[PDB]
């Protein structure tokens, strides 16, 4: 039996993420295909650039404790030289 | 060991590999998705005799 893949349930566009600058057109997987028919490896997910509307005031501070590293981590007490 | 070859291959669609925040990345993403769907469902043993 040449079972096809019913694998295109589309969803509605969600709100744009201002800080990440991405959209969330959604999808889902329903049918694989048990027999030698059409193989369907279509991955779930879709992205899109979007003009941000929020100021994106949320940000990660440099732990407010000690010397900041070049990547984002911090010295606790003795991570010096 | 000098020259190996593939045995098992885990698969992933190409339209997920397109770089984000490009000129028209999202529309090109869904466009290539429709293209690969039309490719995989266009010509095969299913359509032949």
Count of beta carbons in the 10 Å neighbourhood of residue B14: 12
The residue of A10, A19, A43 whose CB has the most chain B CBs within 10 angstroms, and thus the best one to mutate to test that interface, is A43
Least CA distance to B42: which residue of chain A? Answer: A38
**B contact set with A (CB within 8 A):** 11-13, 16, 20-22, 25-27, 29-30, 33, 36-37, 40-41, 44, 46
DSSP per residue over A37-62, as a string?
A: S----PPS---------S--------
- Method used for this model? cryo-EM
Where does residue A21 fall: left (phi above 0), alpha (psi -120 to 50 degrees), or beta otherwise? left
Q: Are B27 and A48 in contact (CB under 8 A)?
A: yes
Closest by Cβ to B46, choosing from A21, A23, A38: A38
Q: What span, in angstroms and rounded, lies between the C-alpha atoms of B20 and B18?
A: 6
Chain A partners within 8 Å of B26 (Cβ)? 23, 25, 46-49
> Which letter, b or e, does each residue of A22-43 get, where b requires 16 or more Cβ atoms within 10 Å of its Cβ?
bbbbeeeeeeebeeeeeebebe
Q: Pick from A52, A69, A50, A37: which is nearest to B47 by CA?
A: A37
Count of beta carbons in the 10 Å neighbourhood of residue A63: 14
Q: Are A47 and B29 in contact (CB under 8 A)?
A: yes
Q: Are A27 and A11 in contact (CB under 8 A)?
A: yes
Q: What span, in angstroms and rounded, lies between the C-alpha atoms of A42 and A81?
A: 50
Beta bridge partners of A22: A17
Count of beta carbons in the 10 Å neighbourhood of residue A55: 8
The residue of A27, A33, A47, A50 whose CB has the most chain B CBs within 10 angstroms, and thus the best one to mutate to test that interface, is A47
A52 CB-near residues (< 8 Å, 6+ apart): A16, A17, A18, A19, A21
Q: What is the resolution of this structure in A?
A: 5.6
User: How buried is B33 (Cβ within 10 angstroms: 0-12 exposed, 13-18 middle, 19+ buried)?
Assistant: buried
Q: What span, in angstroms and rounded, lies between the C-alpha atoms of A49 and A51?
A: 7
């Amino acid at each position: 039996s040449h079972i096809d893949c019913r694998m295109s349930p589309w969803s509605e566009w969600s709100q744009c993420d201002p800080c990440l600058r991405q959209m969330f057109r959604s999808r889902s997987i329903e049918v694989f295909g048990q027999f030698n028919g059409k193989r369907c490896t279509d991955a779930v997910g879709d992205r899109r650039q979007c003009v941000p509307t929020e100021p994106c005031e949320d940000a990660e501070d440099d732990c407010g404790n000690d010397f900041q590293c070049s990547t984002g981590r911090c010295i606790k007490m003795r991570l010096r030289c | 060991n000098d020259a190996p070859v593939l045995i098992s291959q885990k698969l992933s669609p190409i339209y997920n590999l397109v770089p984000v925040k490009m000129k028209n990345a999202h529309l090109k993403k869904q466009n290539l998705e429709r293209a690969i769907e039309d490719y995989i469902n266009e010509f095969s043993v299913r359509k032949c005799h």
